[PDB]
Amino acid sequence: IRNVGELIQNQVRTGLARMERVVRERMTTQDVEAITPQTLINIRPVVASIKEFFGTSQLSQFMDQNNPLSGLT
Amino acid sequence: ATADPVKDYLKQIGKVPLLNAEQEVELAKRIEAGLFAEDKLANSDKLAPKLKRELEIIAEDGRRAKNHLLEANLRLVVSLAKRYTGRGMLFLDLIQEGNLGLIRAVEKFDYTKGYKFSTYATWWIRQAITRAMADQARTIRIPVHMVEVINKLARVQRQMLQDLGREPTPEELAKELDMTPEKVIEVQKYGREPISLHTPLGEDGDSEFGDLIEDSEAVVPADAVSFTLLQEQLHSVLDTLSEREAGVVSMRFGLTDGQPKTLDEIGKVYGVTRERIRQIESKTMSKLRHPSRSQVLRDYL
Amino acid sequence: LEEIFEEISPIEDFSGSMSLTFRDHRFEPPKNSIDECKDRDFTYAAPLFVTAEFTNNETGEIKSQTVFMGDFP
Amino acid sequence: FDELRIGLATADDIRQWSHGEVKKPETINYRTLKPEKDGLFCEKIFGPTRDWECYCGKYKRVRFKGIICERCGVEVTRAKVRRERMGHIELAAPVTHIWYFKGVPSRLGYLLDLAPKDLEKVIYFAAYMITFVDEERRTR
Amino acid sequence: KLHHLVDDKLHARSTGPYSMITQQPLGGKAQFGGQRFGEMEVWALEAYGAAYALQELLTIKSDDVTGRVKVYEAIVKGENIPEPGIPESFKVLIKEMQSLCLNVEVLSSDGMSIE
Amino acid sequence: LRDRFGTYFDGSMGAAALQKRLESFDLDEEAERLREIIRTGKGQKKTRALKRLKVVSAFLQTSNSPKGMVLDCVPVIPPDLRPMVQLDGGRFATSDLNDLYRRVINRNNRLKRLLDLGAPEIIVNNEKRMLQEAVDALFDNGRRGRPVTGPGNRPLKSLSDMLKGKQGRFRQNLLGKRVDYSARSVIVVGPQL
Ligand SMILES: [Zn+2]
């Protein structure tokens, strides 16, 4: 069972993989001494993935609140 | 000839001789030699046949060296196509557009610049690629200068999010862009992309979005039939009026033809003066305003 | 989270001169209350900061700076 | 309704169906939300977006229908004509219908005695054909 | 008490919205959507031999733009129902198959047919 | 071959070669020789000749010429059948045919641009290849290799894709349609009826 922790971890891992590729590309096209950790990392992929995680996912389901037992189930 | 045609394109590049400094400077030398050869051939003054053939041969050799240069730079252009892949344009299409930029650049390159061809070309390659992306990427075409406006505001807004760590307020963005907020909202709304109808609704796998949104061009049967009943009732009401009165009001309001005629405009076929016809128009409007011929038409609005 | 961060080793260019270490991650309290989020249509989230350390052998210097990768649901 | 004859649509037939020619990828101006000229959705070729209305605004009314205003070339008529009228794209270099090839041999038919690999290689620009030889000339 | 309450399930339609690409009525309850007369329904009707009912259920009551306003007018005026025309979905198909380079020409026994 | 000897063998490349071959094809002689082969033939060669005779005879009896295999002009679906309908919220709603027609128009225009100016053989050949690939997609997206995914979330729809399958026009909007003057509801038992 991929508990929710592992699901979100896989998604943020994919996002950080895109971040890694982006920062490597930036490194290949950046000069030295003008490089700071603040500027090089693009936060777009991680947020875009953890936000698209909920969307288009067969696992992020609309909660059903018909009654507390529907919730637990 | 295989799936993923870009692989076959890369193989079609194959192995071609990369050019070191002396090689491409000599290639450019005989390129311009062929250039003057074809220039001399283009002139109308008579030249000896053998000399003309020699000039044509030199121009042909220049052409061959041109294609040598293009095949050598195919690798650079595909690299620069990578550099802008994944923005709504297919990778091979970006490669081809960059190749168009490349043929432009070689058509505008010579050794007179004390630099390698690689440094000079990349500007034109990026130019052609970005022009193509601006003019052919989005479903609803956006002008190039709107394109740079939207990409500028997008990238600077990304910088604002990166710095402040929070969604910037529209006024702060407006002042940073130096434009007013209304332009900010305008370009923000213009910088969208369509959503495809043929997508699963997601409520059910079978259902698709294009089968859930209603049209406006449909003639609602209730409205059409109500309009027809209004037409019949109104025409009957005018038939209640005198023949001349009903006719003149009809032309004044064009029940017979989609264009109503001005009062003077009615006073040509009927043979009445603009003030006379006006007086009867006033008379018709009064008569249809009595409560007799008003109960029926009140409800139809 | 710290596991997936530690998985991404500091990036090395072709020269391997520079490196970015994601040592420590941290949270801050969310700005919006749960009831507020439900009512105003806001994704319940909190900030997630992480300390990025730039180290270059050529410069022989270490520059530490905290960065923020976005709201975390 | 007695028979739905179906067959191969030749180029001349396609030209006959067409009421114009598409020349751009334009769809709609980002600001005016109206169809562009000579592209997809063009009113000059397919039909008016609004009943009897032209693009320039000349001759909008239902009265003077059945005319073509010289300004934008729109023929005033019902919008329903757009559901029927069709255009055509001219291709600089000919291409081959995907359907009749790349399938079972009852539709490709082996009309040319060439293996499917040969066709897959040749029409996709990976190998040449000797279309014609003056073999009598070569022999003489 | 389960959540299959009748108030949710109850739906009806005299005439309402329609789809765009094909002029047939759209589905769902929120949009006044007619129930689907699927393939098995026409199989049953053909089994009964009731051909006129199938014709009206397939042309007048949907998929014919010229017929819908006509039938509404005929009913309210009391006039007898008019003759159904050709459905629009078939025209959509004819154009689409004409866009694949198949000249699907409707023909009559004596030359060209009138439509 | 071309350099060592020209003016004797005429050679070509791509669909244009197919067009030339079909223009110069003499199917009657093929039918005659294949009939001769069937009269005296053995093995699977006989079956291949059978299929070949079937198709060539079908074409010979019909008046329409074989050159219809290679289409020169691509018909376009009328716009209302591929609606770019306005959608509330400043958004848009588009059908994938719009995308495919845009691609084929782009590639045809760019090929025209390349042909106008002096261009090599490699670039023009690759461009014609992309044109053929784009047209392939419009008529059948996904019949070769990966389909034209467009947005990347899903293969784009295609002309023939509308004409096939459970969701195809045939089995969903011509045999079974929705109908006006209809309703639905839960059912209960009433015995007194
Ligand atoms: Zn006009």
Put simply, the answer to whether B139 touches D27 (Cβ < 8 Å) is: yes
How far apart (Å, rounded) are the C-alpha atoms in residues E18 and D140?
74
- Type of residue numbered F152: G
Q: Using an 8 Å Cβ cutoff, are C54 and A35 in contact? A: yes
The enclosing H or E element of F9 equals strand F9-13
Nearest Cα to Cα of residue B85 among B154, B133, B119: B133
Nearest Cα to Cα of residue E72 among A42, F106, B227: B227
Q: E113: burial class by Cβ within 10 Å (0-12, 13-18, 19+)?
A: middle
Please tell me whether residue F25 adopts helix, strand or coil conformation: coil
Nearest Cα to Cα of residue F90 among B185, A55, B181, B158: B185
- Type of residue numbered B258: G
Cα dihedral B207→B209→B212→B213 (10° resolution): -170
Crossing angle of the two packed helices B181-190 and B170-177, in degrees rounded to 10: 100
Strands C18-27 and B195-196 turn out to be: unpaired
Q: Using an 8 Å Cβ cutoff, are B235 and B255 in contact? A: yes
The enclosing H or E element of F75 equals strand F73-75
User: Hey, is the C-beta of E55 within 8 angstroms of any chain F C-beta?
Assistant: no
How far apart (Å, rounded) are the C-alpha atoms in residues D89 and B119?
39
Put simply, the answer to whether E24 touches F178 (Cβ < 8 Å) is: yes
User: Hey, is the C-beta of B216 within 8 angstroms of any chain D C-beta?
Assistant: no
Kindly state the tokens that stand for F137.
């997609």
Please tell me whether residue E94 adopts helix, strand or coil conformation: helix
Kindly state the tokens that stand for C5.
């961060």
How far apart (Å, rounded) are the C-alpha atoms in residues D115 and E77?
68
Kindly state the tokens that stand for F16.
């244009």
The DSSP-derived string for chain D is --EEE--B--HHHHHHH-SS-------B-TTT-SB-SSSTT-TTTT--SSTT--SSSTT-SSTT-S-B-TTT--B---GGGGGT---EEE-SS----TTTSSS-TTTSTTSSS--HHHHHHHTTTSSEEEEEE-HHHHH-
How far apart (Å, rounded) are the C-alpha atoms in residues B12 and F93?
39
Method: cryo-EM
Nearest Cα to Cα of residue E101 among D16, D26, F134, D46: D16
Put simply, the answer to whether A37 touches C69 (Cβ < 8 Å) is: no
Kindly state the tokens that stand for B300.
């139809």
Put simply, the answer to whether E72 touches B225 (Cβ < 8 Å) is: yes
User: Hey, is the C-beta of D132 within 8 angstroms of any chain F C-beta?
Assistant: yes
* Bridge partners, D81 (sequence order): none
* Distance in Å, CA D45 to ligand 1 centroid: 13
| Resolution of this entry, Å | 3.8
Put simply, the answer to whether F126 touches B103 (Cβ < 8 Å) is: no
* Bridge partners, C63 (sequence order): C54
- Name residue, tokens 């154009």: E95
User: Hey, is the C-beta of C46 within 8 angstroms of any chain A C-beta?
Assistant: no
Kindly state the tokens that stand for D129.
């054909």
User: Hey, is the C-beta of F159 within 8 angstroms of any chain E C-beta?
Assistant: yes
Q: Using an 8 Å Cβ cutoff, are C73 and C44 in contact? A: yes
User: Hey, is the C-beta of B207 within 8 angstroms of any chain F C-beta?
Assistant: no
In Å, what is the CA distance from F162 to each residue of E100, F121, F165? 12, 37, 8
Q: Which residues contact B88 (CB under 8 A, 6 or more apart)?
A: B133, B137, B138, B193
- Type of residue numbered F78: P
Kindly state the tokens that stand for B74.
């195919």
Put simply, the answer to whether D7 touches F62 (Cβ < 8 Å) is: yes
- Name residue, tokens 């000839």: B1
* Distance in Å, CA D59 to ligand 1 centroid: 7
Give B-chain residues touching D36 at CB under 8 angstroms: 141
Residues ending a continuous segment of chain B before a break (C–N > 2.5 Å): none
Give the mutation candidate from B162, B163, B166 for the A interface (greatest A CB count, under 10 A): B162
Residue B221 to chain E, least CA–CA distance (Å): 5
- Name residue, tokens 């050794």: B111
Q: How many CA atoms lie within 13 A of E84 on its CB side?
A: 17
Counting as contact any 3 or more CB pairs under 8 A, the partners of B are A, D, E, F
Please tell me whether residue F116 adopts helix, strand or coil conformation: helix
Q: Using an 8 Å Cβ cutoff, are F78 and D84 in contact? A: yes
Strands E36-37 and F177-178 turn out to be: antiparallel
Backbone angles phi, psi at E87, to 5 degrees: -75, 160
How far apart (Å, rounded) are the C-alpha atoms in residues F72 and B228?
49
Give E-chain residues touching B213 at CB under 8 angstroms: 20
How far apart (Å, rounded) are the C-alpha atoms in residues F61 and F54?
11
**Residue B227 CA, distance from chain mean position:** 39
Rounded to a whole number of angstroms, the distance between the first and last alpha carbons of chain F is 92
- Type of residue numbered F39: R
Put simply, the answer to whether B258 touches D61 (Cβ < 8 Å) is: yes
Backbone angles phi, psi at F153, to 5 degrees: -80, -15
The enclosing H or E element of F34 equals helix F27-39
How far apart (Å, rounded) are the C-alpha atoms in residues F36 and F47?
14
Give A-chain residues touching B161 at CB under 8 angstroms: 43
User: Hey, is the C-beta of E17 within 8 angstroms of any chain B C-beta?
Assistant: yes
User: Hey, is the C-beta of E22 within 8 angstroms of any chain F C-beta?
Assistant: yes
Residue in chain E lying closest to B215 (CA): E20
Nearest Cα to Cα of residue F69 among D132, D115, D10: D10
* Distance in Å, CA D79 to ligand 1 centroid: 15
Q: How many CB atoms lie within 10 A of CB E88?
A: 21
Q: Which residues contact B215 (CB under 8 A, 6 or more apart)?
A: E17, E18, E19, E20, F85
Helices (H) and strands (E) in chain A, counts: 4, 0
Q: Using an 8 Å Cβ cutoff, are D139 and F10 in contact? A: no
How far apart (Å, rounded) are the C-alpha atoms in residues D47 and D53?
10
Q: B115: burial class by Cβ within 10 Å (0-12, 13-18, 19+)?
A: exposed
How far apart (Å, rounded) are the C-alpha atoms in residues E63 and E52?
16
Q: Exposure string (b/e) for B17-41, b if CB count within 10 Å is 16 or more?
A: eebeeeebeebbeebeebeebeeee
Residue in chain D lying closest to B257 (CA): D63
User: Hey, is the C-beta of F65 within 8 angstroms of any chain D C-beta?
Assistant: yes
Put simply, the answer to whether F15 touches D85 (Cβ < 8 Å) is: no
User: Hey, is the C-beta of B14 within 8 angstroms of any chain D C-beta?
Assistant: no
How far apart (Å, rounded) are the C-alpha atoms in residues D96 and D117?
15
Interface of E with D (CB under 8 A): 65, 86, 91, 95, 97-109, 113
Nearest Cα to Cα of residue B110 among B20, B24, B19, B22: B24
Nearest Cα to Cα of residue D77 among D92, D89, D61, D88: D61
Residue F41 to chain D, least CA–CA distance (Å): 17
Rounded to a whole number of angstroms, the distance between the first and last alpha carbons of chain A is 16
- Type of residue numbered D23: K
Q: Taking the CA atoms of chain C, what radius of gyration do you get in angstroms?
A: 17
Q: Which residues contact A54 (CB under 8 A, 6 or more apart)?
A: A60, C73
- Say whether D42 counts as a known binding-site residue: no
User: Hey, is the C-beta of D1 within 8 angstroms of any chain B C-beta?
Assistant: no
- Name residue, tokens 């054909």: D129
How far apart (Å, rounded) are the C-alpha atoms in residues B274 and B272?
7
Q: In what order do the strands lie in the sheet with C61-72?
A: C18-27, C46-56, C61-72
- Nearest Cβ partner of B197 from F95, F166, F167? F95
Nearest Cα to Cα of residue C45 among C56, C34, C54, C55: C34
Put simply, the answer to whether E102 touches D14 (Cβ < 8 Å) is: no
Strands B195-196 and F93-94 turn out to be: parallel
Long-range Cβ pairs for the range C23-31 (8 Å, 24+): C23/C51, C23/C53, C24/C50, C24/C51, C25/C1, C25/C49, C25/C50, C26/C50, C27/C72
Counting as contact any 3 or more CB pairs under 8 A, the partners of C are A
Give D-chain residues touching F12 at CB under 8 angstroms: 128-129, 131
How far apart (Å, rounded) are the C-alpha atoms in residues B88 and B221?
43
User: Hey, is the C-beta of C52 within 8 angstroms of any chain A C-beta?
Assistant: yes
Give C-chain residues touching A24 at CB under 8 angstroms: 11, 13
Q: Using an 8 Å Cβ cutoff, are E16 and E25 in contact? A: yes
How far apart (Å, rounded) are the C-alpha atoms in residues B81 and B84?
5
Residue in chain D lying closest to B260 (CA): D63
How far apart (Å, rounded) are the C-alpha atoms in residues B31 and B62?
4
Kindly state the tokens that stand for B170.
């529209």
Q: Using an 8 Å Cβ cutoff, are F169 and E96 in contact? A: yes
- Type of residue numbered E90: F
The enclosing H or E element of E53 equals helix E51-55
User: Hey, is the C-beta of B155 within 8 angstroms of any chain A C-beta?
Assistant: no
* Bridge partners, B230 (sequence order): none
Q: Using an 8 Å Cβ cutoff, are B199 and E49 in contact? A: no
Q: How many CA atoms lie within 13 A of B186 on its CB side?
A: 12
Please tell me whether residue C27 adopts helix, strand or coil conformation: strand
Q: How many residues does chain A have?
A: 73
DSSP alpha helix (H) spans, C1-73: 2-7, 34-40
- Type of residue numbered B268: K
Residue in chain F lying closest to B194 (CA): F92
B–F CB contacts, 8 A cutoff, strictly below = 89
In Å, what is the CA distance from B181 to each residue of B76, B130, B192? 41, 27, 18
- Say whether D56 counts as a known binding-site residue: yes
Q: How many residues does chain F have?
A: 193
User: Hey, is the C-beta of F78 within 8 angstroms of any chain E C-beta?
Assistant: yes
- Type of residue numbered B96: Q
Put simply, the answer to whether F140 touches D98 (Cβ < 8 Å) is: yes
Backbone angles phi, psi at B21, to 5 degrees: -45, -60
How far apart (Å, rounded) are the C-alpha atoms in residues E34 and F180?
5
* Distance in Å, CA B255 to ligand 1 centroid: 26
* Per-residue three-class SS string for chain B: CCCCHHHHHHHHHCCCCCCCHHHHHHHHHHHHHHHHHHHHHHCCCCCCHHHHHHHHHHHHHHHHHHHHHHHHHHHHHHHHHHCCCCCCCCHHHHHHHHHHHHHHHHHCCCCCCCCCHHHHHHHHHHHHHHHHHHHHCCCCCCCHHHHHHHHHHHHHHHHHHHHHCCCCCHHHHHHHHCCCHHHHHHHHHHCCCCEECCCECCCCCCCEHHHCCCCCCCCCHHHHHHHHHHHHHHHHHHHHCCHHHHHHHHHHHCCCCCCCCCHHHHCCCCCCCHHHHHHHHHHHHHHCCCCHHHHHHHHHC
Chains A and D touch (3+ CB pairs under 8 A): no
Q: Using an 8 Å Cβ cutoff, are B24 and B106 in contact? A: no
Put simply, the answer to whether F130 touches B97 (Cβ < 8 Å) is: no
